[PDB]
Design a binder for these strands. Structure first.
Lengths: 119, 115, 122, 56, 229
RNA sequence: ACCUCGAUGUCGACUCAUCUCAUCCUCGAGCUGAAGCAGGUUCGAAGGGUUCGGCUGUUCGCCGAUUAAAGAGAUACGUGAGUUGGGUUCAAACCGUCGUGAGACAGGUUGGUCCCUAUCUAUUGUGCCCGUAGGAAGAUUGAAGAGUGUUGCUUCUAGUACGAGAGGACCGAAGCGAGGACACCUCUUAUGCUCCAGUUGUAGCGCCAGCUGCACCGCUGGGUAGUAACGUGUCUAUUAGAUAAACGCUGAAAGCAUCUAAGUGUGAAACUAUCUCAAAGAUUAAUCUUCCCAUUUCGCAAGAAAGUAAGAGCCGUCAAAGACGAUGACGUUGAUAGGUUACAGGUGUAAGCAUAGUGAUAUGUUGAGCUGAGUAAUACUAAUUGCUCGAGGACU
RNA sequence: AGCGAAAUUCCUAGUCGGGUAAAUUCCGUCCCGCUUGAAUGGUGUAACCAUCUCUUGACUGUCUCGGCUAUAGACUCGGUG
RNA sequence: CAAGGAACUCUGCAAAUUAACCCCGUAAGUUAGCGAGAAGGGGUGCUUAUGUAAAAGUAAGCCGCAGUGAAGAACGAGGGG
C-alpha cells in the first residue's frame, strides 16, 4: 500500500477473463490457472447455452467480450463460431468443457491447469 | 436433509390475502385502518401514495405518506398483515422502483394515472 | 435513540421554537430517549409573545422522530421529523396548539391531555 | 519486540522438528508407464487415456 | 427430569401476526418424529440418560461399527446419535412424535451452535469499544489499551491465565432459552418458534423444555389475513 | 540514600483495568430522642454496580444536571518494545522581575522530532507427535473449572395501617423498564467492487443504432446472496444446602433466668448447589458399549510370506467450516462444485420493430429484458481410474 | 501622562457585567498597578495575516457506536532471503 | 455508514461544508484605494424557433429524481490581542 503494488483487483481479473475467453475462442485451448480456468468456464457455459438463439441481439451482446488478436478479430471469430460451432453443443446440459490438472509452473511452481473442450 | 424452503410458502398459505390489489410504490391507495382502542373496530383511513413496496410473502412490506398540517406522515406497514384492507385508488408513475424525492417536494407535480 | 446535545423543535406553542436536551433524566446511562420520554432541556429559541426566555430549562417529551419507532402491532411507524412538546411536570403540556396530530405510542404513558387536545392522534 | 539471546542448536531443530513436512500425491500411470501424483497429468502428455498434452 | 428434547433444522426465519395484533418472531424448524437409540438407568450405566437416534439413513452409508450396533440393537440407522441425561423412560428403539413431547404455545430452550465467525476481534468477541481518531493515535488506533499487569518485582509481572482473548469466534454449542413454541405440522414434520437463534441453515438444533417457563403454556391465536374477496 | 546512574519512562488524558474492603449503592440484620413518612446508629455484607456536560496540561477543584450509588484505597502517583503529548522539560522569541550584564526566575507570553521486526516467558485460541497399554467406533462421565449471581420504575395491594391533622404505610402480587449481555436477520438500516438501472463527456468500436474503457467502480439510484446493528428476540427468574450478623427454643452454671454448655433450630444481593458451556493428557489417563481381528512354519516368540475386511490417511469435489491448521460433506456405488434447467428475486417494460411528433420522445410491441451470490432438480464436465497405513490380545 | 488584574497584577478561582443549563479560558467594566509606565517609546490606528485566540453558520465517523465493500500486505506457496 | 450532530479536546487538528460561468446583491468601518467572491442568492441538459459572423439570450417543446449531468475549482461571520 506504500505507493507500491495494488496487486489483484476485480476489474483486473474481469479484464483478463474477457481477454482469455476471447483467446480460447481463437484457440479452443488455454494453459492457465484452474482457479481462473473454471472461473471463466461458468460464463463460457452461459454464453454457449445462450448463443444458439442466434439473433442480432446475441450479436450485439457477445460483442461485449473481445478485442484485436494476433489471429482473429471480432468479425472473424464471431462469424466462424456462429456459423459452425454451436449446435454440436446444443444437446448437452452444461459442463461443456474440461479443466484438467497439468504440472505446476516453473516460474512459480504453481499448478497449471489446461482449459479445453472437444466435441 | 431435504431442505426445500418451499415449506416457507406452504405454511404462509394460512395468512395470505388471496386478492392482493396491485399498485406501484408511487401509487395512490387508501386502506381501512382498524381502530380498536380496547373495543369496537372503527375505520380510520390512511390514504396516500405507496412509498416503497417489497414482496416476498408475509414479509411483504411497503410505506405510505400523507402531508397534513405541514407535517409529513411516513408510516411503514407490512403488505401481508391482518386487519389491513387494501384499495388501490389512482395509479402513480415512476420508472424507478425505489425513490425518495416526493417526501420532500412541493405541489402541482402529480403523475398521470397510468393509461 | 435520542440523547444529550441534540436540539429539536418546540412542537407546542408556548413561545419557543427550538430546544436541546441538557440531561435525559432518571436511569443512568439510559443515555437515550424515545417517544414518551420526558427530559430536561434548555431553550435557545424564544419569542416575547410567548412566556419563555432562551436559556430556561424545563421538561419536555418527544412526540415525533425522523427516525420513527416501531408500532407494537408491527406497522413500522416512522416520521420525517423529530418533534417535542413541553409539559409542566405532569401530562398537562405547556403548549396547546397542536402542530400535526401527535403520536399514539404515548397514550398509555399518559399525555392524554394532549391526545385529547387534538382532533386526531398520529 | 526483539530477541535477547541467541539459541542452542537442539531447541532450534526442535522448533524445526514439529516444523515437519508432508509428501506428494500419488497415482499410477499406465496410459504411459509412470506413476504420477494423484489427480494430475502423467509424465507423457496424457491425463488418463488420451494425451492431453504435447510430448514435452 | 422430564427434559423434552427435539432435533430440528433451521429452515426459515420470518414474521407473523397474532392475537392482540402483534408481530411474532418466526423460526421455521424442520423436525421429523425421531427415535431414541438407548436408555440407561441410574443403576444400569450409573446414570439415567437416553441417547436418541436421528437423521435416519440407509444402512451402509455409515461406519460398520455404528451400523453393526444399529443392527445389534436392531434399530433404524440414523447417522446422528446424541444423548441427554436425566431421562430414561423412553423404551429401547422408540420412534416417537414430539407433539407428545411438546405443546403448541409453551416455553422451551433452544441449543444451537452459532455462526462460526473464524478469528475475531475482542471488540466483537468481548465486545469492547473502538478507539478515538483525533490528537494522534497512529496505526495503533485500535488496540487493547493498557495491559500492564505488574511493574517491578512486587506487582505481578505476569499475564492472567484463563484470560479472555479472541480466537475462533462463534461455533460452539450454546442455547437460547424461554422461546415460545408456536405451532406444529407433523404432516410436514415442522415447527415454529420465536426468538433470534444462533446457528446457520441446514444444521440440526436441539430444543429442550424450558428452564424458566415450562409451566407456562400460553397461546394467543394467529390472526389470519382478514379481508379476502 | 540502601539500590540501578557503562541509563529505573517518571504527570496528566484515554483505554484495559484489576485488586482490599475500613461497602457509596443493590441483599439482610440490630438498636433508636425510629407516629407514619422520612430518619439516625451499628454491623453482617465485594455478587454486582456506582453518569454526563462547562471552566484550567492536569486527575484532584469548581460548577450544571442528576440517577442504586456516581465508594474509598492498591498496583513504579499500575498501565507509551498500549497511544497521544497538554504542560511544566530543546535549543527559539518576548514581557514583569533580578543581576550592572551575558545570564537566572514553581513568573508568565508562542510553539517547538515518542525507536522496535517477540528470543523466551506469560497468556490466548488452536494444530500436530506420542499416551491413555489387541486394533477400529461412537457414547459418555465429570477430577478440576468458568461464568452469569445489577437494578430501577407502573399498578394494585392500601390512604390501609400509623398518626390527627395534613401526610403516609408493613407484606405480597402482576407488569413495565433501564441498562446489560448471548444470539439471530423477517423488519429496518448500511454494505452488498462481476445484480440492475439512468448516467456525463472523451478516446473506442466504417455510419444510425447499440453497447466499452476512462474518469470513485465517472456520477445518480435502487437492489438479490451475504455481511454487519441502529433493528429483535432471549436473558436478568426460581430453588435447595451451608450459613453471617441476627432472632430462637430447652436449659444450665448463677435453685432463677440464660439462643450454649448438651440438646433443638431459624435467619443476607455474600457462600454451596440450582442455569449454561467445557472438560478423563483428569499420565486421575476413568467409564459404557460397538465393529473388526486370529491362514503351515524363525527369532532371550516374534510373524519368514497371506498384513482390515474395522477404519484411517494421502489425492480430490467441496462449505455453514475455514489465517492456515484444521471441522464437516462427499468423490462416480457420485450429486461435491460447477455447468444445464425452472423458479425465486429485484433492477423495474429491454433491444428491435411499426405509429406519431420535427424532435427533444411518447406510442404499442412489453412486467420486457436482465439477473455476482438463492432455491430446487439434471451425471453434462470435473470429484481417477489410485497409493499408504491399517488383522493374529505378548503379560496380571 | 498614559494605559492598567494587562503577552507585564502575588494576592487571584480581585470585582461587575456579557459570555456560560452550567464557563480556573475568553469579551467589555471597575484599578492600593507587590516593580505597569511614555523612545526596548506610550496610546490607538484603516488594511491584511501558513499571527494568536474567543464566539459562532454550514459542515461533519471528531464523537457517540459501532461497522460494511475493494484491494497492500499480513496469511499460503515457491524462490531469494 | 442510517440518526443526530462537536457532545472530542486543553481546543472543530482532522474531517467535511465552499467552488465554474451568466445574472442579482452585499454590512460596518474606512484614511477613501477598499472592504468585497464581503454578506447572501437565482438560472444553467437537450429538440425547436429566435437570436449574429460568432453568442451571450429569448420563447416553445422534450426529457430526467435531479442537466460545472463525471474532471476540476473560496467554506462564513463577528471578538479581542
Amino acid at each position: 500500500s506504500y505507493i507500491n503494488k495494488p496487486g489483484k483487483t476485480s476489474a483486473w481479473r474481469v479484464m483478463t477473463v474477457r481477454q482469455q475467453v476471447s483467446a480460447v475462442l481463437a484457440y479452443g485451448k488455454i494453459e492457465t490457472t484452474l482457479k481462473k480456468a473454471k472461473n471463466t468456464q461458468k460464463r463460457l457455459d452461459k454464453l454457449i447455452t445462450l448463443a444458439k438463439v442466434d439473433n442480432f441481439n446475441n450479436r450485439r451482446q457477445v460483442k461485449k467480450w473481445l478485442l484485436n488478436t494476433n489471429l482473429f478479430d471480432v468479425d472473424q471469430l464471431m462469424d466462424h463460431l456462429f456459423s459452425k460451432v454451436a449446435p454440436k453443443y446444443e444437446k448437452t446440459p452444461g459442463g461443456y468443457s474440461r479443466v484438467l490438472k497439468l504440472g505446476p509452473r516453473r516460474g512459480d511452481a504453481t499448478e497449471m491447469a489446461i482449459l479445453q473442450l472437444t466435441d | 436433509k431435504i431442505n426445500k424452503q418451499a415449506l416457507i410458502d406452504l405454511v404462509e398459505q394460512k395468512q395470505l390475502k388471496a386478492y392482493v390489489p396491485e399498485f406501484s410504490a408511487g401509487d395512490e391507495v387508501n386502506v381501512a385502518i382498524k381502530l380498536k382502542e380496547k373495543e369496537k373496530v372503527r375505520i380510520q383511513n390512511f390514504t396516500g401514495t405507496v412509498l416503497r413496496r417489497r414482496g416476498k410473502g408475509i414479509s411483504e412490506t411497503f410505506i405510505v405518506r400523507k402531508t397534513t398540517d405541514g407535517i409529513p406522515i411516513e408510516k411503514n406497514f407490512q403488505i401481508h398483515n391482518p386487519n389491513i384492507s387494501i384499495e388501490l385508488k389512482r395509479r402513480g408513475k415512476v420508472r424507478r422502483a425505489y425513490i425518495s424525492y416526493m417526501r420532500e417536494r412541493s405541489g402541482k407535480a402529480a403523475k398521470i394515472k397510468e393509461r | 435513540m435520542v440523547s444529550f446535545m441534540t436540539r429539536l423543535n418546540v412542537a407546542d406553542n408556548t413561545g419557543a421554537k427550538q430546544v436541546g436536551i441538557i440531561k435525559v433524566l432518571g436511569s443512568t446511562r439510559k443515555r437515550y430517549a424515545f417517544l414518551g420520554d420526558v427530559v430536561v432541556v434548555s431553550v435557545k429559541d424564544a419569542i416575547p409573545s410567548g412566556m419563555v426566555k432562551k436559556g430556561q430549562v424545563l421538561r419536555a417529551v418527544i412526540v415525533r422522530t425522523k427516525k420513527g419507532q416501531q408500532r407494537k402491532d408491527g406497522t413500522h411507524l416512522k416520521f420525517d421529523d423529530n418533534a417535542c412538546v413541553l409539559i409542566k411536570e405532569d401530562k398537562s403540556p405547556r403548549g396547546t396548539r397542536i402542530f400535526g396530530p401527535v403520536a399514539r405510542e404515548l397514550r398509555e404513558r399518559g399525555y392524554n391531555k394532549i391526545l385529547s387536545l387534538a382532533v386526531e392522534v398520529v | 519486540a526483539v530477541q535477547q539471546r541467541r539459541s542452542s542448536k537442539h531447541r532450534r531443530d526442535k522448533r524445526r522438528s514439529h516444523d515437519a513436512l508432508t509428501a506428494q500425491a500419488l497415482s499410477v500411470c499406465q496410459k504411459c508407464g509412470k506413476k504420477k501424483l494423484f489427480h494430475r497429468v502423467c509424465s507423457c502428455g496424457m491425463y488418463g487415456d488420451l494425451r492431453v498434452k504435447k510430448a514435452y | 427430569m422430564e427434559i423434552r428434547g427435539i432435533f430440528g433444522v433451521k429452515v426459515g426465519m420470518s414474521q407473523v401476526f397474532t392475537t392482540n395484533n402483534e408481530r411474532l418472531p418466526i423460526t421455521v424448524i424442520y423436525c421429523e418424529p425421531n427415535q431414541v437409540a438407548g436408555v440407561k438407568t441410574e443403576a444400569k450405566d450409573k446414570y439415567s440418560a437416553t441417547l436418541l437416534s436421528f437423521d435416519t439413513v440407509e444402512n451402509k452409508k455409515l461406519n460398520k461399527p455404528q451400523q453393526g450396533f444399529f443392527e445389534k440393537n436392531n434399530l433404524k440407522p440414523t447417522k446422528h446419535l446424541q444423548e441427554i441425561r436425566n431421562m430414561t423412560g423412553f423404551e429401547m428403539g422408540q420412534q416417537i412424535t414430539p407433539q407428545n413431547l411438546f405443546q403448541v404455545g409453551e416455553y422451551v430452550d433452544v441449543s444451537a451452535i452459532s455462526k462460526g465467525r473464524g478469528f475475531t476481534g475482542a471488540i466483537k468477541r468481548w465486545n469492547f469499544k473502538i478507539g478515538p481518531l483525533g490528537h494522534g493515535a497512529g496505526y495503533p488506533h485500535r488496540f487493547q489499551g493498557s495491559v500492564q499487569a505488574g511493574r517491578g518485582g512486587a506487582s505481578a509481572q505476569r499475564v492472567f491465565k484463563g484470560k479472555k482473548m479472541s480466537g475462533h469466534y462463534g461455533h460452539e454449542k450454546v442455547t437460547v432459552q424461554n422461546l415460545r413454541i408456536v405451532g406444529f405440522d407433523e404432516a410436514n414434520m415442522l415447527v415454529l418458534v420465536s426468538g433470534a437463534i444462533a446457528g446457520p441453515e441446514g444444521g440440526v438444533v436441539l430444543i429442550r423444555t424450558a428452564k424458566k417457563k415450562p409451566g407456562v403454556v400460553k397461546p394467543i391465536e394467529l390472526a389470519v389475513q382478514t379481508e379476502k374477496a
